[PDB]
Design a protein around this ligand. Structure first.
Ligand SMILES: [Mg+2]
Ligand SMILES: [Mg+2]
Lengths: 222, 204, 196, 212, 195, 125, 233, 222, 195, 196
């Protein structure tokens, strides 16, 4: 019987800073034990300083990103070229996803940008459009490998102030864009070593008030 | 109805400079329900340490079995079994039950009393040996531990540093697994002394 | 079921066995599997008897209506109509059709619409067992611009062999010869073809 | 998941955990399982996260249209029945919902309706929904009184989630507290279960089984 | 066979076991005792598959009674629990496994300490201050986690048990027809006549 | 379906079909409504040109919509029955969904809405 | 919801410095590895695009027709139909990609794997894949079925990354494709000796080679192989 | 897993990758898949790892006892016949897929064994998830009358095709060269093309970071 | 939704309906009223699939309340039962059938007679002196067959109902948390405050 | 798999293709399907490779032990041993075997043990596709007391046709000639047989 879903592998990572936000993804596209492409981007500038990735089934992910980019275009037409705020985008994507509640988009969606106060924002969605704002979210094949590391290095979870008998937590604080990209690069090189579906290349889209910048880094090709 | 993920729990082992570390969570559950916060998964036969994750009845049964076999080994050989030899015994004993296996993920840790060489090894439920310089992981949060270990681990750590690394590897892995946690124990193993520390972690 | 269509010098010949089976019971031992969809456009049906009879009857209607408006249709046009029905309704149909037709311009032509619902134009075609087409079946045995008598003997031999090894095929061998001269019906009884 | 809501003299206490799980994997510890329908109405998330989030956000829209047309706050009864009638239409399609619709109006007083995806709509004084409901019900049933103060009622709600967070593998992360008054709901903060457990253990003398 | 509870207090172990036996749509009995005395200071409560429960309990009883005669000595609760676990661990890879869950409550005369052991049908043994089998733990563990103190008296323990039984009678859909309560202490095994 | 726009605008800005509907009302038997301090009274005229009438069974001029709301009318009797039926259905529909009987203002706003819809729908007067 | 009956096997392709190459064997395969012959699975659309299709032959012939229709439609009320407003590979791909995905989303898929090979109007190489699920991806080498498993590794030794495309000549690229087709004839039961190869070059246009045969095959070593272990005669 | 065997002028060479996988997760980044049956008879394993090791050691043990009993160097046909009769008896329930190669008094031999107990003869063979990638290279570059150096190059190239293109294979290339009248040479990590790049950051924790409830000295002595 | 009983005595109809609402392993409510007043002298009790029961009951209630307003007349119990049966008979060949079982207890003011109607989810209507749905009939019919008399008083009927409820509480495995009892007579519908 | 055995004047010839498939992948393209169970008793194996190799090895053992005690065994005796193994273990075996042997008394003989586990003695036998034996297969094409050169050409042609229409068959054509003179191994490469 025809199965309308597939797994194209890949893993994505969204981190929110103080005055910036990054959305990273590996560039490897797979089916079973074969490599389809060593460079197939799945992190996209959608306009209005919103970056998006729909990781999982690449056909559903391409479809959703295409529909959202089109949603941004028609928002400009219908509302006098008004900028689509990240929170407004997030609610729109919920409706796009929940639209297919009984034949879902088989993707984990993450968007990143700045909120209306200019502070870094990341929103993560389940396949049917439940969403939440987060400082830190990994999605896809190697999410389970990356996420507990971020908990420890970003949110400083389980780290206590040396000498305080484990009574005083290590204090939360915003990381620089430089310090975040280090954690992203180390997250993906680690995932590349221990997950067969992760490797080939890493593409990071950084979102500041100045716009959307790209950085590319090689990963192991085995 | 997957025997390896009914009771839950994790073991991790790591090598350092003239030392090894092995650590486990203390949770035993019946699926969603937490039953015990004192279920240690690390046993020792002389100076050879064995961690076992998976079905708890098999964890208990294999401990009782390897105590039996290492007790008889010592009486006949007139010396304590070494990690390398014990690894082969775990492998033999598991593959003996090839078509009716123990639902376990055992981890061996210890220092060879002759050569002083740090040794760790891991097995699948039918006894395929994974011998590793760096680290071995087992249990329901094995994916989480692989991620933590592959990023945190560096070679030739001193006992006091290795303790911090393996502790942070286990705690942060167990916090991203529903069926792991409820307390943790870390064994730091030097050539002729062994310290055992209980970690403070969230109890949910 | 063993059916074949062979193009020769003067046109094309359609041959088939006369056996229809329900399980191991021979429902009809004198079946006419050669079906007219136009004066010089015939087809051989394999698959579901209900499905191929339903399709053949609709194609016959379409070629009657085509002839009324646009005059005599090409064999290619008949193959297209067959394919359209078979391809669009592939999910609810089990039908494999061999189309043989004579035009004065194009002479003899053979088209196969197999279970896929695809269309293929061949110099000849054989379908044996459960609508199973053979690509080769003695390539060196078939030559282009064969005589009528050569072509009858070639089909008679091929269908003789199929009946011998296959319980689905049997009874008499029916042939239809499509030429400028007209339409000739041939019947070959077991005692003629069995001793070959 | 553990969500509870109960009626008392001071209004309604609503308490939820914040953990989401995909298999044994903990997807999030920061999930919001209280949906702020509007400033006077609260809903709890159990079953499908998307189903609850989407249809209770939609319910807020329907409630806004009601008060625009009738120039009167919608009754909890009316708000609950809009949602229950909607999920009943989708019955058999595979919606997953276990929610408490909570409000305090002049006419009704403090009112809680349990609404679920097979069309059940129940008015009640105490409701617990989720994998950890049985644990929460235990603490609630033995300590609940109508004449509870607002301070003690808030603690009881928080303590009941902590009970479930401890024992249920699929409950934990943090506790989110709400007090629903006639003038609207008041948020009473996010409480990390990690820090709360040790604090409650020491001060209450409970959880002797656990070494700390 | 549904509800079996156990509480280990300062100087004794309390076992509470439901009285109802249900077969199909009818409650056949409302006075069933789901416990066997293994030795004068060791009691075992059991719940699970019909027939298997009693057959397993009586088999263990006979083996401990045999050891007592042979050695003229009472096996320790730890020793009895280890023996019982091994029998269940054999059962799980048998042709037809015993589907029986047990609580072993005993007073160790050598240590002068009460001991409660929880063993499931797989042979999963655990030593606990309080324990249960099946759904019983889902409605009482939250209550026990709260009130249990290890220096509790027998009377304090019985009151804490009443609270658990009351919570079960309220939130549990099936009628277990109340519980038989037995106390195991230094003086042996006695049944609380009225509960 | 019959689609013709019967209710349309005239050069002077009037809708003659709506205004000619008011003429039908003016022809109707008189109906009066007087509300007191703790009551409302609905008085209705019955033309006396009809003797040998059976007052038992003859449709009453005042209709209960719910147990607490009543509707009287002037104009085409047959037309009134369609508004009364729609109003009675909406009264039970409101109770079912809002779990409360209609306010008098709500029931009015519904009936007025039905009357309005028939002034700019195709194929209806 | 269907099952393929008659199918075509692997389509392989790669980019070189000035264009793209694509090849496909001329065979139709029945269910139990029975063989049809004379099936062309390379579809030239205009002078700048070749579409290689694998999978159900009936669905291939349908897509062949859509592309033929597409060319006719583009010519309608278009004075620049053979110049600036001629069909581009990117346009033809996106159309097919759209059709595949909306067919899978109706649970009535076209049972095909498609590679669109061509050169754009600015001379950019175009190579992109779409299948019955509407999944799309691009790479310096692309292959379907067995080609993905055996041909890709051989072609990736010539063009491992984007920067290797300028260094790869048409002579080298054609060699790699022809060699890879021989490997697939050796090891794929559904493959045939007869194949078609198409080169789309920005300077030299589209060259379409038909009735190509696998040559320089190695079978001599077979004489010395006897039994499955112990047999010496 | 990618394993290959290549016959040359005066012997046979087998090679394998060094990646061990639990589903999509890499368990061992440098495991040895080249097993010794006898000093000059080596085995490459694919399928169930426990089964290939277990079956190789059992036959290896029985071969040593047979060698001692007969006072003769063990033959590859003996290892072959004993492996296939064992595997056949278990009807594929022992998931061992082997390439058996070696030299004996009779000469140089190369065989494949299937889990069901079928065997094949060849000059070049490949097995595992990377067999098709490896076989493409063998069918491209293999010729009659290879030298030792040509056969090692072809073998390691065949494994590399697997490492890069197959997700099931990766890390390093192990080779064993069995020449006639020579000791077999085992070349562990013959190639190491997948070295992990330097990390961006050291994750060594300040001492006391971890909260501790209890310390106690363990007694390992008598 | 489990236990719904009905007894028709000399001058009234008595409906007894279990108070428990169970979802999964927990009893959500112990005060649930599984009845709707269709008209001042007609009461309907219901049991079956969650949601469907109340949705069906309220739908019937609205349709009878509509008829009452339109005709300024109370539809007879026979008429209400025939309407309800037809709605269930439509439901059984629907896309998704209402899985609801009902008892209709009414006093016919024209005949001055009490009437009890039993309609199952298929639309199987039957007029009975006493009725039940599901397993409830299995424990009480034998008791009703024995003691029921057509000239019983309301007080005699309530005592006979107590006997039925006592037999259910004894031999029925689930706890239905008692019953709400409602009497339908010439004076309308009233609830027995204590049972 | 296409295998055939033909008896001629001087003995019997065994022919087969060289193709082994796992699904659509060709596991071995130079397979030797001609297996020696005695000096002048060979067989062609079709079905499970593991099952036929296991059976062939046991029959080889039985004929070695037979030869030690009772001298050279007849082809009939070899067919009997094959059948015994195949018939008694039919429930756990998928094996179809063609046995070809030369005796000086009986000359060339061909026996087939199909999937049933039955034994049949024929002048020749063909198995095409999945161990599918053809009764007829050009009866008029085969004559008794054919020459070696006729018989090689007859087998070469038959196996040529099978490879053409069947993807299971392919690679080289292997033959073994069993005569008084001895055992001759023939190999025919694709370029020889494809142009037929
Ligand atoms: Mg990788
Ligand atoms: Mg945890």
């Amino acid at each position: 019987q025809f199965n309308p879903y597939g797994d194209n592998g890949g893993t994505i990572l969204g981190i929110a800073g103080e005055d910036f936000a990054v959305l990273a993804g590996d560039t490897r596209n797979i089916t079973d034990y074969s490599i389809n492409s060593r460079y197939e981007p799945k992190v996209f500038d959608c306009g209005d300083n919103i970056v998006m990735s729909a990781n999982g089934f690449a056909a559903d992910g391409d479809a959703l990103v295409k529909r959202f980019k089109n949603s941004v275009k028609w928002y400009h037409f219908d509302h006098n070229d008004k900028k689509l705020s990240i929170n407004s985008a997030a609610r729109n994507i919920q409706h796009l996803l929940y639209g297919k509640r009984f034949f879902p988009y088989y993707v984990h969606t993450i968007i990143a940008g700045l909120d209306e106060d200019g502070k870094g924002a990341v929103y993560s969605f389940d396949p049917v459009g439940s969403y939440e704002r987060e400082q830190c979210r990994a999605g896809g094949a190697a999410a389970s490998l990356i996420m507990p590391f971020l908990d420890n290095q970003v949110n400083f979870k389980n780290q206590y102030e040396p000498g305080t008998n484990g009574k005083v937590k290590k204090p939360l604080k915003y990381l620089s864009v430089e310090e975040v990209i280090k954690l992203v690069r180390d997250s993906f090189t680690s995932a590349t070593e221990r997950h067969i579906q992760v490797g080939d290349g890493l593409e990071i889209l950084i979102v500041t008030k100045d716009g959307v910048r790209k950085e590319f880094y090689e990963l192991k090709r085995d | 109805s997957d025997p390896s993920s009914i009771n839950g729990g994790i073991v991790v082992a790591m090598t350092g400079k003239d030392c090894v570390a092995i650590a486990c969570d203390l949770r035993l559950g019946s699926q969603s329900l937490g039953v015990s916060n004192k279920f240690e998964k690390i046993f020792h036969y002389g100076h050879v340490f064995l961690g076992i994750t998976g079905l708890a009845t098999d964890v208990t049964t294999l401990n009782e079995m390897f105590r039996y076999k290492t007790n008889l080994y010592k009486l006949k050989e007139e010396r304590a079994i070494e990690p390398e030899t014990f690894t082969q015994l775990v492998s033999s004993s598991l593959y003996e039950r090839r078509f009716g296996p123990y639902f376990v993920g055992p981890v061996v840790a210890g220092i060879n009393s002759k050569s002083g060489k740090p040794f760790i090894a891991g097995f699948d439920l039918i006894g395929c040996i994974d011998e590793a310089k760096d680290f071995i992981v087992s249990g329901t949060a094995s994916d989480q531990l692989f991620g933590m270990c592959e990023s945190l681990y560096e070679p030739n750590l001193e006992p006091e540093d290795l303790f911090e690394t393996i502790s942070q590897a286990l705690l942060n892995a167990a916090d991203r697994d529903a069926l792991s946690g409820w307390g943790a124990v870390v064994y730091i193993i030097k050539k002729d002394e062994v310290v055992k520390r209980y970690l403070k972690m969230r109890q949910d | 079921t063993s059916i074949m269509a062979v193009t020769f010098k003067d046109g094309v010949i359609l041959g088939a066995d006369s056996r229809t089976t329900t399980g191991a019971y021979i429902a009809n031992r004198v079946t006419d599997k050669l079906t007219r969809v136009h004066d010089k456009i015939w087809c051989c049906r394999s698959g579901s008897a209900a499905d191929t009879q339903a399709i053949a009857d609709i194609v016959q209607y379409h070629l009657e209506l085509y002839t009324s408006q646009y005059g005599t249709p090409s064999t290619e046009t008949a193959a297209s109509v067959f394919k359209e029905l078979c391809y669009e309704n592939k999910d609810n149909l089990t039908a494999g059709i061999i189309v043989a037709g004579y035009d004065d311009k194009n002479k003899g032509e053979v088209y196969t619409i197999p279970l896929g619902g695809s269309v293929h134009k061949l110099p000849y075609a054989i379908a044996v067992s459960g609508s199973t087409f053979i690509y080769g079946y003695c390539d060196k045995n078939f030559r282009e611009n064969m005589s009528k008598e050569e072509t009858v003997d070639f089909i008679k031999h091929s269908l003789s062999q199929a009946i011998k090894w296959d319980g689905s095929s049997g009874g008499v061998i029916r042939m239809v010869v499509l030429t400028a001269a007209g339409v000739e019906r041939l019947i070959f009884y077991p005692d003629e073809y069995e001793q070959l | 998941t553990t969500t509870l809501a109960f009626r008392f003299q001071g209004g309604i206490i609503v308490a939820v955990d914040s953990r989401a799980t995909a298999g044994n994997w903990v997807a999030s510890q920061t999930v919001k399982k209280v949906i702020e329908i509007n400033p006077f109405l609260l809903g709890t998330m159990a079953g499908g996260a998307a189903d609850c989030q989407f249809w209770e956000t939609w319910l807020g829209s329907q409630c806004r249209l009601h008060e625009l047309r009738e120039k009167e706050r919608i009754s909890v009864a009316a708000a609950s029945k809009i949602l229950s009638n909607l999920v009943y239409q989708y019955k058999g399609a595979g919606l997953s919902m276990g929610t408490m619709i909570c409000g305090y109006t002049r006419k009704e007083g403090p009112t809680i309706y349990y609404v679920d995806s097979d069309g059940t709509r129940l008015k009640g004084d105490i409701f617990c929904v989720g994998s950890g409901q049985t644990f929460a019900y235990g603490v609630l049933d033995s300590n609940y009184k109508w004449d509870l103060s607002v301070e003690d009622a808030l603690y009881l709600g928080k303590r009941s989630i902590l009970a479930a967070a401890h024992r249920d593998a699929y409950s934990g992360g943090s506790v989110n507290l709400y007090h629903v008054t006639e003038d609207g709901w008041i948020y009473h903060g996010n409480h990390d279960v990690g820090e709360l457990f040790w604090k409650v253990k020491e001060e209450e003398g409970s959880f002797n089984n656990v070494i700390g | 066979m549904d509800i079996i509870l156990g509480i280990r207090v300062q100087d004794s172990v309390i076992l509470a076991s439901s009285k109802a036996v249900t077969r199909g749509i009818s409650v056949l009995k409302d006075s069933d005792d789901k416990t066997r005395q293994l030795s004068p200071h060791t009691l075992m409560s059991f719940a699970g598959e019909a027939g298997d429960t009693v057959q397993f309990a009586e088999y263990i009883q006979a083996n401990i009674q045999l050891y007592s005669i042979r050695e003229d000595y009472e096996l320790s609760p730890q020793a009895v629990s280890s023996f019982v676990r091994q029998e269940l661990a054999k059962s799980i890879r048998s042709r037809r496994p015993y589907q029986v869950n047990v609580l072993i409550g005993g007073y160790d005369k050598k240590k002068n300490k009460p001991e409660l052991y929880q063993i499931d049908y797989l042979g999963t043994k655990v030593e606990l201050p309080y324990g249960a089998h099946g759904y019983s733990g889902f409605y009482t563990f939250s209550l026990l986690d709260h009130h249990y103190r290890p220096d509790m008296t027998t009377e304090e323990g019985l009151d804490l048990l009443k609270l658990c039984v009351q919570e079960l009678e309220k939130r549990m859909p099936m009628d277990f027809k109340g519980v038989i309560v037995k106390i195991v202490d230094k003086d042996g095994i006695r049944q609380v006549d009225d509960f | 379906g019959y689609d013709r726009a019967l209710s349309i605008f005239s050069p002077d800005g009037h809708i003659f079909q709506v205004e000619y509907a008011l003429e039908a009302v003016k022809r109707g038997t008189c109906a009066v409504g007087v509300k007191g301090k703790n009551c409302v009274v609905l008085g209705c005229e019955r033309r006396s040109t009809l003797k040998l009438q059976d007052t038992r069974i003859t449709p009453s001029k005042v209709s209960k919509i719910d147990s607490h709301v009543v509707l009287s009318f002037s104009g085409l009797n047959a037309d009134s029955r369609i508004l009364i039926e729609k109003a009675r259905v909406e009264a039970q529909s409101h109770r079912l969904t809002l779990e409360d009987p209609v306010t008098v203002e709500y029931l009015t706003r519904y009936v007025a809405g039905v009357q309005q819809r028939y002034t700019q729908s195709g194929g209806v007067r | 919801t269907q099952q393929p009956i008659v199918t075509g096997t692997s389509v392989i392709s790669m980019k070189y410095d000035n264009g793209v190459i694509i090849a496909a064997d001329n065979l139709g395969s029945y269910g139990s590895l029975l063989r049809f012959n004379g099936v062309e699975r390379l579809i030239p659309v205009g002078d700048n695009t070749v579409v290689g299709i694998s999978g159900d032959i009936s669905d291939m012939q349908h897509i062949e027709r859509l592309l033929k229709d597409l060319v006719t439609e583009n010519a309608y009320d278009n004075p620049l139909a053979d110049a600036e407003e001629a069909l581009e590979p990117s346009y033809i791909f996106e159309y097919l990609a759209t059709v595949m995905y909306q067919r899978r989303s109706k649970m009535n898929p076209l049972w095909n794997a498609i590679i669109v090979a061509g050169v754009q109007s600015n001379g950019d190489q175009f190579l992109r894949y779409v299948n019955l699920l509407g999944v799309t991806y691009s790479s310096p080498t692309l292959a379907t079925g067995f080609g993905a498993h055996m041909a890709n590794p051989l072609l990736r030794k010539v063009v491992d990354r984007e920067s290797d495309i300028p260094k790869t000549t048409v002579q080298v690229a054609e060699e790699a494709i022809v060699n890879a087709m021989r490997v697939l004839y050796y090891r794929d039961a559904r493959s045939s000796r007869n194949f078609s190869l198409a080169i789309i070059d920005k300077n030299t246009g589209l060259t379409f080679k038909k009735n190509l045969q696998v040559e320089n095959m190695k079978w001599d070593f077979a004489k010395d192989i006897k039994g499955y272990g112990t047999q010496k005669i | 897993t990618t394993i290959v065997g290549v016959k040359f002028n005066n012997g046979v060479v087998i090679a394998a990758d060094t990646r061990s996988t639990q589903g999509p997760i890499v368990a061992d980044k440098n495991c040895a898949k080249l097993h010794r049956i006898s000093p000059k008879i080596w085995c490459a394993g694919a399928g169930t790892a426990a089964d290939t090791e277990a079956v190789t050691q059992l036959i290896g043990s029985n071969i040593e006892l047979h060698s001692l009993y007969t006072s003769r160097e063990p033959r590859v046909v003996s290892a072959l016949q004993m492996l296939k009769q064992h595997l056949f008896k278990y009807q594929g329930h022992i998931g061992a897929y082997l390439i058996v190669a070696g030299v004996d008094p009779t000469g140089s031999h190369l065989f494949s064994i299937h889990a069901h107990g079928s065997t094949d003869v060849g000059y070049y063979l490949s097995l595992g998830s990377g067999s098709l990638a490896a076989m493409a290279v063998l069918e491209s570059h293999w010729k009659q009358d290879l030298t030792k150096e040509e056969a090692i190059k072809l073998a390691s190239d065949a494994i590399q095709a697997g490492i890069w293109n197959d997700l099931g294979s990766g890390s390093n290339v192990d080779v064993c060269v069995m020449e006639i009248g020579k000791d077999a040479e085992y070349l562990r990590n013959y190639l190491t093309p997948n070295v992990r790049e330097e990390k961006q950051k050291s994750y060594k924790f300040p001492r006391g970071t971890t909260a501790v409830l209890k310390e106690s000295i363990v007694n390992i002595c008598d």
